[PDB]
C-alpha cells in the first residue's frame, strides 16, 4: 500500500483504490494501473520533472529502500492477477530488485523528488508507474 500526496491530490495504484476515492475521482487509467483523487487537506510531496534512470524506491515486503536502475516509461506486458487480466501496462518502468504484490504503493524517487509508485514485479523484477508526465499535478 501507499500514496503520492501533492497539492490537493491523492495518488493511488488504481487497483488498491477505495470507494471513497472513487466517489473523489479526479483521474484514472486503468492501463497505467493509476488512480487520483481530491483531498481537503494540502500534500507536501514534489513530483519530479526530469528524465532520471536510476534512484531509491521503499520496498514494504523488507522495510528498506533500495537504489535501483530503472526502464524509460514504456508499454510492457504485465501477468494476470487478481486485479488484471494479462495485459499491456503503459508508462512502466522496470528495474531488478525484490517486490512482492503487497509492496504496491511504496514510492521510487530521485534527486529531483517522486518519480512514480511500485506497481508490478515478481521473479527478481519490480515495476514503477511513472507520474513525472502528469503536470497538472502541480497546478
Ligand atoms: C509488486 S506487484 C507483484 C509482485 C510480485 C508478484 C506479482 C505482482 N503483481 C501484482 O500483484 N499485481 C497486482 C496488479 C498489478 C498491476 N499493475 O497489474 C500487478
Ligand atoms: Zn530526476
Redesign the pocket.
Known amino acids: 500500500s501507499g500514496a503520492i500526496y501533492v497539492g490537493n491530490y491523492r495518488v493511488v495504484?488504481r487497483?488498491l483504490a477505495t470507494h471513497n476515492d472513487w466517489a473523489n475521482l479526479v483521474w484514472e487509467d486503468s492501463s497505467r494501473?493509476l488512480l487520483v483523487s481530491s483531498t481537503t487537506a494540502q500534500g507536501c510531496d514534489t513530483i519530479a520533472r526530469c528524465d532520471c534512470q536510476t534512484g531509491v524506491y521503499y520496498c514494504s515486503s523488507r522495510r528498506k529502500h533500495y537504489p535501483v536502475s530503472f526502464s524509460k516509461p514504456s508499454l510492457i506486458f504485465?501477468e494476470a492477477?487478481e486485479?488484471?487480466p494479462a495485459r499491456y501496462?503503459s508508462h512502466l518502468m522496470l528495474a531488478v530488485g525484490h517486490?512482492?504484490?503487497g509492496?504496491?504503493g511504496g514510492i521510487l524517487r530521485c534527486q529531483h523528488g517522486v518519480v512514480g509508485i511500485?506497481?508490478?514485479?515478481?521473479n527478481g523484477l519490480?515495476g514503477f508507474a511513472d507520474v513525472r508526465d502528469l503536470l497538472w499535478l502541480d497546478e
Open positions: 495504484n487497483h494501473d504485465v492477477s486485479y488484471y501496462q517486490s512482492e504484490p509492496d504496491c511500485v506497481s508490478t514485479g515478481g519490480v
